[PDB]
Design an enzyme around this catalytic site. Sequence first.
Site, PDB file in Angstrom:
ATOM      1  N   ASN A 119       0.792  -1.219   0.000  1.00  0.00           N
ATOM      2  CA  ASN A 119       0.000   0.000   0.000  1.00  0.00           C
ATOM      3  C   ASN A 119       0.830   1.277   0.000  1.00  0.00           C
ATOM      4  O   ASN A 119       0.262   2.360  -0.168  1.00  0.00           O
ATOM      5  CB  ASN A 119      -0.926   0.022   1.227  1.00  0.00           C
ATOM      6  N   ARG A 258      -4.766   7.856   9.897  1.00  0.00           N
ATOM      7  CA  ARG A 258      -5.899   7.418  10.701  1.00  0.00           C
ATOM      8  C   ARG A 258      -6.707   8.649  11.085  1.00  0.00           C
ATOM      9  O   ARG A 258      -6.135   9.654  11.519  1.00  0.00           O
ATOM     10  CB  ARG A 258      -5.451   6.664  11.962  1.00  0.00           C
TER      11      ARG A 258
END
Lengths: 353, 356
Positions: A119, A258
């Site tokens: 990723n 996040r």
Amino acid sequence: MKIVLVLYDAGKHAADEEKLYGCTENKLGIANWLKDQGHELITTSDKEGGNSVLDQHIPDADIIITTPFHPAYITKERIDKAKKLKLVVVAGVGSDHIDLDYINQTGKKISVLEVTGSNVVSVAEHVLMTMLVLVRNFVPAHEQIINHDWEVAAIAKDAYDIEGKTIATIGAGRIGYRVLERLVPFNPKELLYYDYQALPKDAEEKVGARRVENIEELVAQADIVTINAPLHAGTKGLINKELLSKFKKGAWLVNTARGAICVAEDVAAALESGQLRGYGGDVWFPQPAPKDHPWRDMRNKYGAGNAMTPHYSGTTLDAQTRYAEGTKNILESFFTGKFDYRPQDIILLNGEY
Amino acid sequence: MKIVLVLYDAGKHAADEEKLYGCTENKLGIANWLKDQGHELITTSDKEGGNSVLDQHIPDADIIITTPFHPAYITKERIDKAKKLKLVVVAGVGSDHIDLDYINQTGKKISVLEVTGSNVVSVAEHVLMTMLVLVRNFVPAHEQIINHDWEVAAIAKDAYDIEGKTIATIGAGRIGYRVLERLVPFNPKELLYYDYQALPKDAEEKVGARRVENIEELVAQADIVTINAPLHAGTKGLINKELLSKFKKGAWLVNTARGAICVAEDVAAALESGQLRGYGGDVWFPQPAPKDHPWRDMRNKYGAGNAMTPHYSGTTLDAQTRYAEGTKNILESFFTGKFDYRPQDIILLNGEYITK
């Protein structure tokens, strides 16, 4: 062995694009391979509730494959009832949804692995694109065109070149560093980074980075801040109103790590008040974002400064190919008994860190 | 001396931002400098029509200052009436709105200059942005959020990483090379270019570029094509139905050079049919773009693949500072009688071309 695979239903979208491996309809492109070895594959997206399909097969599942983009929560209860569980695979990167601590605490010989690195390039590209879109004021520019207007001066008054700006990353790991690599030819005034461990000297010099010792000092001198650090006690709610008031007036802020690293209302207030010029990213808290999430409708004074997208940076078709191939390599190492895993892929080896 | 300055009107937006130099309201930040030196400044956006402000002061104007973003057309007819015109300045880069041929062929003694290099990074950054936007399918992604929807599979099915892709540029000039320089760390599969002359071997090695002799072979293998060439007899209408049929199927196309290099409706048809995955840029023909210009409403089969914007890539506040400073330096060279212009800024010096 019994394999349970939890992915989202792509509906008609699965059928348009056969490269979309990470859905229930395409089954990571390994369904036939699993059948050829001789193995039972259970595929489902129903992961909520006591009577869900996932819970009906947990008792005798040998292997569970999950993904961060439709995460089946591997709870203390679910682990208790998993009599035959040996291996949990994240077809992707991210194990927030697994109760790693409990597995370790019970002594069960359960391995947990992820496709490390699949990723990093995808996310790093997303950061730079987000940086350019915000700095160059692209969103209002494109909105004009499809609204059938033409007014350059409304766009140019808040449009800048990324050249000559100070760019800072909170976190210089795999993603954050590859962000710094891609910014070099754009000729930033300076590249800054803060992290709990130093970049290697050779790595630091390749990108012309300078380490800053404490976060208040880093954000105070940076035109652009990007969050690329893991979520732990030190970073939870790190971006709150006190720190935001230490930002350079009119800074740009990007977050793809996040959503819980920010306080949602504080960020929106800062954008409205002008402390920030723009905020962009693809991570939210809660996630998926409710219709009422403040980050959907927040806008700077000019009606701009929002480059929000759903959580998809890491699920591009190129990343999915890497998830599918990595999951296959992981299963291969497990079926053959070699256990010749890539070291970076191991989260827990037989219940041990 | 009399100076005519022709910029667009920024209205309220000028008040919002003092650094927005390139409008009639802020007058490139040189109005007080010119007043102190004892010259007469005329500022107007009225540039079309025979009784416009521009045509009222042309007869005795010593200097005319223009910008590509609100171009006053220095035509033969207007040149014939400028009895005192000595200097035409482009506050920016681009001279298509000036009849350079007529000046050079008649021999009238008029110098024309531009602020060379002041737009290159701005435009090059805009190219990289558009590429990432189209390849990563960002526009439909954002429209989901602001429409209070959340459906990742609808976006992911046409989203790609720019890594491992083949990127080609039509034109390897200043802007074209800059685009290649910034693409290197994104790790493309290969960088290609097509131009009428080759890059120096060192320039090629630095970005790892490979030259392709004819366009038909360049486009056929390229995932991403960007046009960075000037408009001339070889490039007008270049991107048309025939050439587009030979693109790689599912290709992304970016154009920030000139709208006329494409045939507008051939591109739209290619995008709607699936020949192209997307199209983006900031240049239009006609410019400004009519409300019904087909490029506004065109979309790929998924209702995405449009990354169009108004013509503004080179008028960012950073660039406008460069445009404003360069214009002041040029006038200072002229006013003092030094004529110590930067060599690269000269298009015509007293009606003659110069060695470049």
